[PDB]
């Protein structure tokens, strides 16, 4: 469920593996579609900070600039042809994922700064 540790993240850019875009997109959907009141999937603009621990399993916190998609929840989100608009409001949110060894993917928390 989780890896616990105060410290110790490691800083990893955004183009030091294609992965960490993957995982924010998984985070920002899956979230955004158990959020009250929402009628479309969120979706990533940019990976702004990537971080990861590792024991066994890892801890993947990522900042990331969100904003609302045109695609609906009724819909299969997808990784890019959901992208938002410009003028669509931004925040940035901030996600731990945990990933086990057997690659299950926790997330262990998703929290917005207010715009």
């Avoid at 990533?44 to 900042?63: D, H, M, P």
């Avoid at 819909?75 to 086990?100: E, G, L, P």
Wanted: aromatic share 8%.
């Amino acid at each position: 469920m989780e890896l616990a540790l105060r410290g110790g993240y490691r800083e990893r850019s955004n183009q030091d593996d294609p992965e960490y875009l993957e995982l924010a997109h998984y985070a920002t959907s899956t979230w955004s579609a158990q959020q009250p009141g929402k009628t479309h999937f969120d979706t990533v603009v940019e990976v702004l900070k990537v971080e990861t621990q590792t024991v066994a399993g890892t801890n993947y916190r990522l900042t990331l600039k969100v904003a609302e998609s045109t695609c609906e929840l009724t819909s299969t989100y997808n990784k890019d042809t959901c992208q938002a608009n410009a003028n669509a409001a931004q925040r940035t949110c901030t996600t731990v994922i945990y990933r086990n060894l057997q690659g299950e993917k926790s997330i262990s928390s998703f929290e917005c700064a207010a715009a």
